Design an enzyme around this catalytic site. Structure first.
Site, PDB file in Angstrom:
ATOM      1  N   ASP C 356     -40.521 -17.926  29.154  1.00 39.28           N
ATOM      2  CA  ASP C 356     -39.395 -17.560  28.308  1.00 39.28           C
ATOM      3  C   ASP C 356     -38.280 -18.593  28.428  1.00 39.28           C
ATOM      4  OD1 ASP C 356     -38.137 -15.289  26.612  1.00 39.28           O
ATOM      5  OD2 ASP C 356     -36.633 -15.646  28.170  1.00 39.28           O
ATOM      6  N   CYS C 380     -37.565 -20.437  12.722  1.00 39.36           N
ATOM      7  CA  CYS C 380     -36.987 -20.474  11.387  1.00 39.36           C
ATOM      8  C   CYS C 380     -37.128 -19.158  10.637  1.00 39.36           C
ATOM      9  CB  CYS C 380     -37.629 -21.600  10.571  1.00 39.36           C
ATOM     10  SG  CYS C 380     -39.405 -21.399  10.305  1.00 39.36           S
TER      11      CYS C 380
HETATM   12  N1  LIG Z   1     -37.800 -16.459  22.978  1.00 35.70           N
HETATM   13  C1  LIG Z   1     -38.681 -17.441  22.787  1.00 35.70           C
HETATM   14  N2  LIG Z   1     -38.912 -18.308  23.777  1.00 35.70           N
HETATM   15  C2  LIG Z   1     -39.790 -19.287  23.587  1.00 35.70           C
HETATM   16  N3  LIG Z   1     -40.509 -19.549  22.510  1.00 35.70           N
HETATM   17  C3  LIG Z   1     -40.268 -18.678  21.536  1.00 35.70           C
HETATM   18  C4  LIG Z   1     -39.386 -17.612  21.583  1.00 35.70           C
HETATM   19  N4  LIG Z   1     -39.392 -16.922  20.397  1.00 35.70           N
HETATM   20  C5  LIG Z   1     -40.251 -17.558  19.660  1.00 35.70           C
HETATM   21  N5  LIG Z   1     -40.819 -18.633  20.288  1.00 35.70           N
HETATM   22  C6  LIG Z   1     -41.803 -19.532  19.748  1.00 35.70           C
HETATM   23  O1  LIG Z   1     -41.172 -20.632  19.159  1.00 35.70           O
HETATM   24  C7  LIG Z   1     -42.017 -21.177  18.134  1.00 35.70           C
HETATM   25  C8  LIG Z   1     -41.179 -21.436  16.889  1.00 35.70           C
HETATM   26  S1  LIG Z   1     -41.937 -22.607  15.738  1.00 35.70           S
HETATM   27  C9  LIG Z   1     -42.052 -24.103  16.763  1.00 35.70           C
HETATM   28  C10 LIG Z   1     -43.060 -25.061  16.145  1.00 35.70           C
HETATM   29  C11 LIG Z   1     -44.005 -25.656  17.190  1.00 35.70           C
HETATM   30  N6  LIG Z   1     -43.569 -26.994  17.572  1.00 35.70           N
HETATM   31  C12 LIG Z   1     -45.431 -25.680  16.655  1.00 35.70           C
HETATM   32  O2  LIG Z   1     -45.824 -26.799  16.277  1.00 35.70           O
HETATM   33  O3  LIG Z   1     -46.098 -24.647  16.621  1.00 35.70           O
HETATM   34  C13 LIG Z   1     -43.157 -20.182  17.926  1.00 35.70           C
HETATM   35  O4  LIG Z   1     -44.303 -20.689  18.564  1.00 35.70           O
HETATM   36  C14 LIG Z   1     -42.640 -18.926  18.621  1.00 35.70           C
HETATM   37  O5  LIG Z   1     -43.684 -18.116  19.057  1.00 35.70           O
END
Ligand SMILES: Nc1ncnc2c1ncn2[C@@H]1O[C@H](CSCC[C@H](N)C(=O)O)[C@@H](O)[C@H]1O
Ligand SMILES: Nc1ncnc2c1ncn2[C@@H]1O[C@H](CSCC[C@H](N)C(=O)O)[C@@H](O)[C@H]1O
Ligand SMILES: [Zn+2]
Ligand SMILES: [Zn+2]
Ligand SMILES: [Zn+2]
Ligand SMILES: [Zn+2]
Ligand SMILES: [Zn+2]
Ligand SMILES: [Zn+2]
Ligand SMILES: [Zn+2]
Ligand SMILES: [Zn+2]
Ligand SMILES: [Zn+2]
Ligand SMILES: [Zn+2]
Ligand SMILES: [Zn+2]
Ligand SMILES: [Zn+2]
Lengths: 440, 330, 582, 349
Positions: C356, C380
Site C-alpha cells: 500500500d 484516473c
Molecule cells: N491505494 C493504492 N495504492 C497503490 N496502488 C494503487 C492504489 N489504488 C490503486 N492502485 C493501483 O494503481 C494503478 C493505477 S493505473 C497505473 C498504470 C500502471 N503503470 C500500469 O501500467 O498498469 C492500478 O494498478 C491500481 O490498482
C-alpha cells in the site's frame, strides 16, 4: 451363499493356501493371481477390477476400494499423491480385526502400497506389482484377435504427405503433435461441434485444420471424394462411457452412439483390398468403462486395446485405452528430456507444489474439508493458490499458453482441457510414424 | 424397328428397347421404371415385362420363369392370333427362355442382362447397389445368415430352402455379440444377410440399437470380395420400435431412406414396418401418406396392449420375391 | 444587481429551452465567472452544471425546477446518456444544497434510481423552497451573439479569425487549432478539458468545435469518433446542414471529409502539428526547462534503481528489460491482487513489492535508497472528467497523486551531490484544466501530451510529466511494432477498424454500439476482442497477462488501465544511454 | 539526600558528575546538560517532559534544574525567561541566597551573566550544542529540534502565513514591531498561484504558519487542499541544505478534516496530530489539531480527549449559526518556545 470370514479364518489356520482363494469376492473358481497382493482372484473379480482399478472420484481419491472394488463405504488414504483406498471389510478381514480404527487414529495413514513395510499379516504386497498390473491391463483380455498387419517402411524418396481424419480432435492435439514431431500433412480435416474447440483449432494452427461441423453430417461419399486417407484418429466422448457417472448411459444411448459413427467412417477410410498404402488408425478412450462396453468396442474395431498411462511421461494420472495398429503401441513409455514429468519442474515462479504428479484440476467450488488440500495442490508464499490454467496446460505437454483463444473463462477452458489428449502420450504413439512418413 | 417404339407405337424414340429389339418412348421408360421389378402378392411380376400393364398377363409355363407378357404386346409385335394360341397352350415356353430368337417381328437380344444393367445404371438418378442377374443354368442355392429370430420358415415357404435340409446354409444366433472374424469365415460364404428387431411387446433389457449395430458389423464382415460378380444383398426391417434418432442413425449407417411397408386392412392400419434395403424396385413400395403421429400412437397402444408379440411374417413376403430371379427356386 | 421582477436570481438551477434545445438543465450566475462583460435586462447568464458551454438564457425560456417531473423529458434520459450524467450532477448538487443525502455508465444507471424516484415523489423532504442557494451563491452580450457575429462573418465586416467559433467572444487570444477562427481563453480551458474525452462506447463525448456536448451528431464512418453539435453546424456551416447530415446514413464528419472547406468553416491543412503544439505549449504557467544531466561515461554506468508507484502489471520493468537495462532493484507499490500477482509471476520476482502506497514513509525510501528512477501513474478513475461521478483531485483516488508527490521528494537528491535522477508521471488527458494546472504545479514540471497513436495500435493519449530527456522529440515508428489492428489479429480474422479505441464490450451496448465494439470479423460475423488482442494492440508481449484465472472482464479492466508499451519504450530510450546496458 | 549533597561534596570530596544534582540520587546515568553535574533517570525523564514548557504568563512552567513550578523566580531582563527553584539555589548556590535574590528586584540569571562559577554552580563551555547532543542521544523519539541562538545573535523572525493571519498573535507575543513594514511577515490569502521562485524572492523564511479557516462557511476549495498547498509551500521555503538554519512550521486545523485526511496528514508531515483542547467550566468550548515542528509540542497533548466528543462538537458548531471566529487563545500560547530562538520586542513600553 458367500462367507469370506470363514474362508479367511480357515486360511489363517494354515489349512488353505491364500493363492487358492479369491480375495475380491471369495469365489473358489481361481484362474489368475491378484496383481496387487498375494492370493488368487476369480474371473468375475477380474471383470469388476477392470471397472474400478483406475476410477477416480472428481474429489481426487479412489471412489471405491482397490480390493473389494465397490462398496457403500471406503477409507481415504492419508498420504498425499497416492489415491488408492481400502474398505473396512478388507482391513479388518485380511490385515486383522481392529485395524481400521487404528488406521483412522493415525492421521498420516499410509496405504498398504505406499508404506515401506510389505508385510501386513495375511495381506502382503507383491514386489513387482507395477509389472504384474501392466500385464493385467495389457497382456490378458477376453479377445483373441490376430495381430494387425505391419507395413514395411518405404524409401525416403517416395514418402508422401499424410492425410488425416482427426475425428473428435477437440483441442486439436493430433495436428499439433504432428507438427511438433516434424511430420508434414497434406490435408487435415476434422469433425467437431464445440465452438471453442474449433476456434482453437483454427487460430493456434494457422487454419491448417478444415472442419466439417458435426460428425453426424459426414457420410461415406464425402470420405470417398475427400480421400484417399492414411491416418484416422478418434477421441470419442467419454461422458456417457466412463463408469464415473451415476447415470451409466452406456455405449448404446447418449454420446456413446458417436463411437459407432467413428467406426463407420473408419470402414469408409481403410482400403478395400488394395493394401497399397500404410493405413493407420488410432482410437482413444478412458480406462474406467464397463467390461461389456470394452469387449463391444474391441470386437467392433477388431483390435486388442493397449493401455498407455500419462503418468510415466507427464505429470497427470491420465491412463487411457488406445486401439489401433501403430507400430509398437505396447512399447514401454520413453521419458524424453524435452517433455516435463514432474509438477515442481513445470511450476510457475515463486510457487511450491505441495503435491507431485497431480491428477485433480477441477476446483469443485472449494469442495469440503476433505476436498480441501487435494483440490488445492499449490502453496504460494504461505497461502494456498488454486491451479492456474497455464500450469495444467504445461503438465499435459501442451505449449505454454496454447489455449488463450476466444477469451474463454476459467471454467470453459477447464472443461476444454479436462477431456484433452496428453501431448507426450500422442508423441510416443506417433513417433514410429516419422520413420514411415516424410519429415519436413 | 429402332425408329418405332414397340411399347406404345410412338414414332419418337430415345434409345434401344431394354429387353428386346425395337424402340421405346420416354413415358414408356418411366412406366417400365416405376415397375422395373415390382411384384404383387401372388409371387409373380405385377405388370407386363414389355408394356408394364397389369390388365393382361400371360403366366409362363416354365417353372423357372416368372416374367409375363401382355395380350396387346403379343398381338401387335409377334402377330395377330398368337395371343389365343399362347393362352390355350398348356405348357407355354414364352420367348426368352427358349434359345430361339426369331419369332415374327419380335427379336430377342442375346445376353439381355448386360444391357438391362447398363440401362438401369444409365437411368438411375437415385441408384442402389445391385448385382447382375444370373442365367438359368448358372444360379446357385442361397446362403443366409439369420439374426436374432427364426427365419427359416419364411425362406422355405418362398422356395429358397427345402424342408429337412442341413443347417450348413442357415445359421441362427441370438447372441452374435461373441462373433469373430474367424467364426464368420468358418461359417463360409453368405449371399443374403437378414436381421430384424423382435416384435413390439417383447421384453428387451438390452438397448434396441444392439440389433442394429452388430447387424451392421456382420454386414461389414459379409461383404463379398472386391470385384466379384457375387450377388450379395442385405436388408434390415424394424417394427417401429426404434426412436427417430435411432432411425436417422440406421438410415445413415445403411445409406438408405427408411422405405416403409404399411399393412392396411379395411381402411385401417394395424401394423407397419420400416425397411432399409438395397433390393431393386423397393423405392416403388414406399408409402408417403404415412405420418409419424398415427404410427406412434399405434406403437404406444401396442406396448400398452396385453396381446403377445407376434412377428409379422406376411409383411416381409414381398421383400424376397425378386430374389427368385437371382437364385435357385426349389 | 440583476433585478427584473421575474425571479431567477444568482444560484438558482432550472432547465432551459434555447433554440434547438429540449430543456437542458443548468444554473444562473453572474458575469465574472464566465469571462464576459455586463449583462442586460432579460440577459440571464446561464451556468449549465452539466457538460454544456457558457451562454445566456432569458426568463421566457426559463421555468422553475420545483416542477421537476412536470417538464421532464424521457427520450433524452433513455437515449442520450450525457443527459443522464448531467441529471446525476445536478441532482447531487441540489441534494447537497438541500442537506439531504441518498463501468461508469453502469454505475450511473444503478445510482440514479433513488434520486429519480425522490424527484418523482415531489421533493417532499425539503419542498420546492428547499432548493435555495447556500447563502453564498445568492460591453453587453445578447441572446443571439453567435447568430449575429456569424451574420457578419460572411458579410466580411469582421474577420473569422477575429471571432471565436466556440463561444462568439471578441477576446480572441490564440487561434483555434483544429478549425480556422479565433478562440478565447475559456474556450482554451474547455478544449484542454474535453478534446480527447472518448466514452467507453467509442465516440467523442462532446462537439469538436466548441467542446460542448448537448446534441451531437455521430461521425458515420469508422475510425472517426469526433462529434459535431447542432448549433455549431447550424451556424458555422449553415441552416439545414444538420438535417441533411443526419438524413444520409454513412455521413462523413467535416474535418474527416475529403474537401478542405465547408462554407464559413474550413479545416486547417496543418491541423496535427498545430494541435500537438496546442496541447503541449499553451498551458497557462511557464516553468524553466528541466535540468539535464551530463552523459556518464560508458565505463561507469551503474545499474538502474527504479521505484514504480502504482505499478499495476509492471509495465515499467518490462520495458526496462526489453531495453536491455540492468535493474539493481525494482521496488513497486500496488494493492490490486491480480496486478501484484501478475507482476510477481511474469517476471522473475525481482519486484520487491511494498504493497500500500499510503503506508510507505520517508524511512522506507531512505532505507531502500538512493532511487534514481521514480515512475508512476495516479488512478484516473476519479480524476478523468469523463466520469459522471467526478469527485476531484483532493478527494478519493486522485488524492493518491499527492502521495506520489511525497515519495518523489523522498527520492529527489538535495541541492548538492549532483548525481543522475529521472522521474516520470502518467495521467489521463481528458481531465479538468484546473486539476492539470495543480498537478503540473506540484511536480514543478510541465507536461507533454504523448499520443499512443503515433507508435501503438490504440489511441491511449496520456499526459507524461517528468525530466526524462527527449519528451519533446516526435515519436518514432519502429519496424517491429504493430500500427494497425490488422497486424494484431489472430489468423483468419479481418479487421473492421484501421485503429481501435474500444476494449469494453459494454454488454453489447446498443445497435449504435454495434459496429463499434466488435472490430473483428472472424467467421464472416462480428466478434469481441480477445484477451490476447489487447495485449498485441497495446504492444505487450503475447500472452503477457495470462496469469491466474483472470476472466475476460478482469483482464480487460486490468489491461485498460496499463501504459502503452511503445510509448514507454520511447520515453525510456535515453535511459539506455544514461544507465547500465547489457 | 536532597540536603546532603553539600555534605557529600564538601566532606567526602567527590566529583559532582557522579551524583545527581536535580534530586541528589547517588545513581546516575548521564551528565546534566544545563549545568555540569549528574542526573538520574526520573530526573532526566521529567527534564525532557518540561524542557521547553511554558505557562500562560509566558515563563517556564517548571524549574530549569529541579523542574519544580512552586518557587519560580522571574528574570529582570525580558529576553531571558529562565526560572529557578528555592531548593536548588539553597542547595548548590548556597543557603540563604534565595531570599536575597527574591527580595531585590532586577536579576540576571546564571545562564545569562557570563560568570562560569558561582559557589558549586558551574556553566559548561559551549553548552548550547551540548543541549543538542543531550536531546539527540537521550531521547527515545528525538524527532527534530534545532540548536538555539544566543540573545545577541537573534535576528527578527521572518514568518509566512497561509489562509490565516498570524501577525496579531506574533504582536501579542512581542515577536514583531507594531506598525513595522511587512517584510518580516507576508500573508497569502490565495496561494494557488505562487511558484518556488516567487517564494524565494520574498526572502528566506524561518517559519511557515498555515491554518485552515475555522468551522462554518468553509470555502468551496476542499479542506485537503488547505494542507497539500501548505506542504508544497513549506517544501519551497525549506532552507538550502548545507546550512541548517532554525526552521519551524505549525499547521493547525479547526476540526474540519475527516479521519482519512488526518491519516493523510500524518503520512505527509510525519507527525501525529497533537490535539489542543480548550475547556471552560468543564465544557469543551473548542479544540484544534496541531502538526508542529517547534519543540515541546507533545507536552501539552491531552490523553482524555476523544474523537467522538470532538465530532459531536463539530456537528454542534455546524448546526449553530455562530460567526467564523478563530481560536486565538489556543494557538497564541504555543509559540512561546520560539522566544528562546528569535529576538524579543517589548511592545508594552
Ligand atoms: N491505494 C493504492 N495504492 C497503490 N496502488 C494503487 C492504489 N489504488 C490503486 N492502485 C493501483 O494503481 C494503478 C493505477 S493505473 C497505473 C498504470 C500502471 N503503470 C500500469 O501500467 O498498469 C492500478 O494498478 C491500481 O490498482
Ligand atoms: N456429436 C458430436 N459430433 C462431433 N464432435 C462431438 C460430438 N459430441 C461431442 N463432440 C466432441 O468430441 C470431443 C470428445 S472429448 C475428446 C477431445 C480430444 N480427444 C482432445 O484432445 O481434446 C469433444 O471435443 C466434444 O465436444
Ligand atoms: Zn472372487
Ligand atoms: Zn474392500
Ligand atoms: Zn497411500
Ligand atoms: Zn412408346
Ligand atoms: Zn419363360
Ligand atoms: Zn405387354
Ligand atoms: Zn471563445
Ligand atoms: Zn460545438
Ligand atoms: Zn470523420
Ligand atoms: Zn536525580
Ligand atoms: Zn530548581
Ligand atoms: Zn536571565
Amino acid at each position: 451363499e458367500r462367507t469370506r470370514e470363514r474362508l479367511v479364518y480357515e486360511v489363517r489356520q494354515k489349512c488353505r493356501n491364500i493363492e487358492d482363494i479369491c480375495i475380491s469376492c471369495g469365489s473358489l473358481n481361481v484362474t489368475l493371481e491378484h496383481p496387487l497382493f498375494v492370493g488368487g482372484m476369480c474371473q468375475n473379480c477380474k471383470n469388476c477390477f477392470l471397472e474400478c482399478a483406475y476410477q477416480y472420484d472428481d474429489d481426487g481419491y479412489q471412489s471405491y476400494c482397490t480390493i473389494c472394488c465397490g462398496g457403500r463405504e471406503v477409507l481415504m488414504c492419508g498420504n498425499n499423491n497416492c489415491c488408492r483406498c481400502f474398505c473396512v471389510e478388507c482391513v479388518d478381514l485380511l490385515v486383522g480385526p481392529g485395524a481400521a480404527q487404528a488406521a483412522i487414529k493415525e492421521d498420516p495413514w499410509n496405504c498398504y502400497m505406499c508404506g515401506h513395510k510389505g508385510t501386513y499379516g495375511l495381506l502382503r504386497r507383491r514386489e513387482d506389482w507395477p509389472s504384474r498390473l501392466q500385464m493385467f491391463f495389457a497382456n490378458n483380455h477376453d479377445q483373441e484377435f490376430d495381430p494387425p498387419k505391419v507395413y514395411p517402411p518405404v524409401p525416403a524418396e517416395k514418402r508422401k504427405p499424410i492425410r488425416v481424419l482427426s475425428l473428435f480432435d477437440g483441442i486439436a492435439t493430433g495436428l499439433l503433435v504432428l507438427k511438433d514431431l516434424g511430420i508434414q500433412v497434406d490435408r487435415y480435416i476434422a469433425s467437431e461441434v464445440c465452438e471453442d474447440s474449433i476456434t482453437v483449432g483454427m487460430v493456434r494452427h494457422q487454419g491448417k485444420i478444415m472442419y466439417v461441423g458435426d460428425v453426424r453430417s459426414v457420410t461415406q461419399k464425402h470420405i470417398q471424394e475427400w480421400g484417399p486417407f492414411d491416418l484416422v484418429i478418434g477421441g470419442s466422448p467419454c461422458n456417457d462411457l466412463s463408469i464415473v457417472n451415476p447415470a451409466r448411459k452406456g455405449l448404446y444411448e447418449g454420446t456413446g452412439r458417436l463411437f459407432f459413427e467413428f467406426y463407420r467412417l473408419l470402414h469408409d477410410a481403410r482400403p478395400k483390398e488394395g493394401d497399397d498404402r500404410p493405413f493407420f488408425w488410432l482410437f482413444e478412450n478412458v480406462v474406467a468403462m464397463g467390461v461389456s462396453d470394452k469387449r463391444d468396442i474391441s470386437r467392433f474395431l477388431e483390435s486388442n486395446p493397449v493401455m498407455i498411462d500419462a503418468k510415466e511421461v507427464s505429470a497427470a494420472h491420465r491412463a487411457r485405452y488406445f486401439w489401433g495398429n501403430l507400430p509398437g503401441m505396447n512399447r514401454p513409455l520413453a521419458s524424453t528430456v524435452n517433455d516435463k514429468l514432474e509438477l515442481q519442474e513445470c511450476l510457475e515462479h515463486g510457487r511450491i507444489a505441495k503435491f507431485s504428479k497431480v491428477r485433480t484440476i477441477t476446483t469443485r467450488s472449494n469442495s469440503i474439508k476433505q476436498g480441501k488440500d487435494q483440490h488445492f495442490p499449490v502453496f504460494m508464499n504461505e497461502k494456498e493458490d488454486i491451479l492456474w490454467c497455464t500450469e495444467m496446460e504445461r503438465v499435459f505437454g501442451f505449449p505454454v499458453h496454447y489455449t488463450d483463444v476466444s477469451n474463454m473463462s476459467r471454467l470453459a477452458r477447464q472443461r476444454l482441457l479436462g477431456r484433452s489428449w496428453s501431448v507426450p502420450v500422442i508423441r510416443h504413439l506417433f513417433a514410429p510414424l516419422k520413420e514411415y512418413f516424410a519429415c519436413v | 424397328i429402332e425408329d418405332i417404339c414397340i411399347c406404345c407405337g410412338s414414332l419418337q424414340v430415345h434409345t434401344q428397347h431394354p429387353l428386346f429389339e425395337g424402340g421405346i418412348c420416354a413415358p414408356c421408360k418411366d412406366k417400365f421404371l416405376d415397375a422395373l421389378f415390382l411384384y404383387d402378392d401372388d409371387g409373380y411380376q405385377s405388370y407386363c415385362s414389355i408394356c408394364c400393364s397389369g390388365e393382361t398377363l400371360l403366366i409362363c409355363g416354365n417353372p423357372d420363369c416368372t416374367r409375363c407378357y401382355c395380350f396387346e404386346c403379343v398381338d401387335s409385335l409377334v402377330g395377330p392370333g398368337t395371343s389365343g394360341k399362347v393362352h390355350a397352350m398348356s405348357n407355354w415356353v414364352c420367348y426368352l427362355c427358349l434359345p430361339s430368337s426369331r419369332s415374327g417381328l419380335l427379336q430377342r437380344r442375346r445376353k439381355w442382362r448386360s444391357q438391362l444393367k447398363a440401362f438401369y445404371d444409365r437411368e438411375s438418378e437415385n441408384p442402389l447397389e445391385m448385382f447382375e442377374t444370373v442365367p438359368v443354368w448358372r444360379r446357385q442355392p442361397v446362403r443366409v445368415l439369420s439374426l436374432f429370430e427364426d427365419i427359416k420358415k419364411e425362406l422355405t415357404s418362398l422356395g429358397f430352402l427345402e424342408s429337412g435340409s442341413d443347417p450348413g446354409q442357415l445359421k441362427h444366433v441370438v447372441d452374435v455379440t461373441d462373433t469373430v472374424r474367424k467364426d464368420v469365415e468358418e461359417w463360409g460364404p453368405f449371399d443374403l444377410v437378414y436381421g430384424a428387431t423382435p416384435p413390439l411387446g417383447h421384453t428387451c433389457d438390452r438397448p434396441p440399437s444392439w440389433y442394429l449395430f452388430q447387424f451392421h458389423r456382420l454386414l461389414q464382415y459379409a461383404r463379398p470380395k472386391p470385384g466379384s460378380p457375387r450377388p450379395f444383398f442385405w436388408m434390415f426391417v424394424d417394427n417401429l420400435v426404434l426412436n427417430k434418432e435411432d432411425l436417422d442413425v440406421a438410415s445413415r449407417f445403411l445409406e438408405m431412406e427408411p422405405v416403409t411397408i404399411p399393412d392396411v386392412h379395411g381402411g385401417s392400419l394395424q401394423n407397419a414396418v420400416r425397411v432399409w434395403s438395397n433390393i431393386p424396385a423397393i423405392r416403388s413400395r414406399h408409402w408417403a401418406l404415412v405420418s409419424e403421429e398415427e404410427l406412434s400412437l399405434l406403437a404406444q397402444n401396442k406396448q400398452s396392449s396385453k396381446l403377445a408379440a407376434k412377428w409379422p411374417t406376411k409383411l416381409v413376403k414381398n421383400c424376397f420375391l425378386p430374389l427368385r430371379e437371382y437364385f435357385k427356386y426349389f
